[PDB]
């Protein structure tokens, strides 16, 4: 076979616009496979100096987390002040979730339907998911809105926040997502509801993964079942959303395993009444942005791919880790060795697939030409 690089726009050098910043050296190339003989090429990755950020804070407002909501009224400005050191562009948003509004999960008596908690506490009626504030670059509005939020109450310890994650990920323009680093913070202190638990409430339709927000409120919470982790992983990967789990110490292992399952996400240890959320977020972002994961899209049948990693400090990994290069710092070049194998001659004369680092819109186009 052979190969030829078409565009190969030079990656941005050491110190503009999120779309004008390049982080993959080769862009488009053609591989002329020769059946058994495979073809290989190399692509350079270089972390950008400063890249915009979009953070969406999704918090649990059950009766538990009552104290946490009292120590978040200053997060809007504090996080922005502590984040300017990292990027010159930043936007923040807020959102809350409690539970599906059906019988087995929430008491249906009117007295408990208006005030789910005890008479001493003045709670609000339960809701599935509310988009308090779309992404914005002003922290004063964040503080003002989050200050007046009211806690809610429920019945069962686990909370139905997975559907909230789905609505956040798929709604797009309503949430104001941009084509920059998308961060999602998921704050809770209890387990989670996934597909199959809606059968106890008479809900059997699987989640369809669509934006069902009317007046910043998630309707249809009674119609569709909770989303399975596979669906959440698929949608998060498709939307390039990186998740941070800020959960208490009691439920640490569950979310550790969850983050093991989900790609490009981190788990923190929220403490006290959300005292150290800012440092947790910064640490999680630093940990996430210092790794690169390469993935391909729907490789054609009869074609198999292989990844090789040329990391920093002389460590050269292979195997399934060939697509993973950890410990990359700011402006630290990294190279990958990619080889494509084609063990047949598919009728498709030329089928192309894209290799894309997780969490970035930058793509390298690979065009195959069998024979």
């Amino acid at each position: 076979g052979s190969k030829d690089i078409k565009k190969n726009k030079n990656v941005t050098n050491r110190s503009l616009k999120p779309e004008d910043i390049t982080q993959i050296q080769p862009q488009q190339l053609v591989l002329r496979l020769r059946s058994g003989e495979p073809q290989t090429f190399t692509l350079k990755f270089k972390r950008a100096e400063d890249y915009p950020i979009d953070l969406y804070y999704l918090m649990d407002l059950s009766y538990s987390m009552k104290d946490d909501l009292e120590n978040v009224k200053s997060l809007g400005t504090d996080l922005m002040n502590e984040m300017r050191r990292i990027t010159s562009d930043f936007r923040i948003g807020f959102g809350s979730f409690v539970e599906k509004t059906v019988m087995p999960y929430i008491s249906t008596t009117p007295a408990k339907l208006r005030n789910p908690c005890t008479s001493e506490q003045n709670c609000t009626s339960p809701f599935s998911y509310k988009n308090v504030l779309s992404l914005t670059n002003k922290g004063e509005v964040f503080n003002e809105l989050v200050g007046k939020q009211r806690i809610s109450g429920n019945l069962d310890s686990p909370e139905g926040g997975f559907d909230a994650i789905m609505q956040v990920a798929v709604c797009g323009s309503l949430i104001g997502w941009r084509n920059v680093t998308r961060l999602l913070v998921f704050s809770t202190d209890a387990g989670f509801h996934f597909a199959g638990d809606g059968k106890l409430g008479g809900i059997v339709l699987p989640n369809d993964g669509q934006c069902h927000l009317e007046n910043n409120m998630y309707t249809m919470s009674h119609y569709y079942d909770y989303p399975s982790i596979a669906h959440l992983v698929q949608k998060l990967s498709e939307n390039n959303i990186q998740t941070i789990f800020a959960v208490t110490e009691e439920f640490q292992p569950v979310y550790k395993e969850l983050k093991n399952l989900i790609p490009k996400s981190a788990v923190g240890t929220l403490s006290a009444n959300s005292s150290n959320v800012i440092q947790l977020i910064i640490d999680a972002y630093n940990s996430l942005s210092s790794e690169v994961i390469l993935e391909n899209g729907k490789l054609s049948e009869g074609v198999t791919i292989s990844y090789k990693s040329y990391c920093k400090n002389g460590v050269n990994g292979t195997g399934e880790n060939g697509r993973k290069c950890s410990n990359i710092s700011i402006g630290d070049e990294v190279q990958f060795e990619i080889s494509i194998t084609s063990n047949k001659c598919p009728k498709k004369d030329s089928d192309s697939f894209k290799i894309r680092p997780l969490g970035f819109t930058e793509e390298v186009e690979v065009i195959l030409q069998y024979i």
Partner: protein, 63 residues
């Protein structure tokens, strides 16, 4: 005696306050995972503990 549960969707903070009030009340507290049971509680003690648990939103019992 009194055995509050607080095992539903109840804040963790409002579960060691009951333990603190019981211990500072001179009684004996048998701590457990999201469950507290006391011993040597008198009628006035049991009534006060039940009232406090009800105000806190816990699920008070008696043994």
């Amino acid at each position: 005696e009194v055995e509050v549960h607080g095992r539903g969707d109840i804040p963790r903070s409002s579960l060691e306050l009951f333990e603190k009030v019981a211990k500072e009340l001179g009684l004996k507290v048998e701590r457990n995972h999201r469950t507290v049971t006391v011993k040597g509680v008198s009628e006035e003690q049991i009534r006060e503990l039940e009232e406090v648990a009800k105000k806190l939103g816990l699920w008070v019992l008696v043994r």
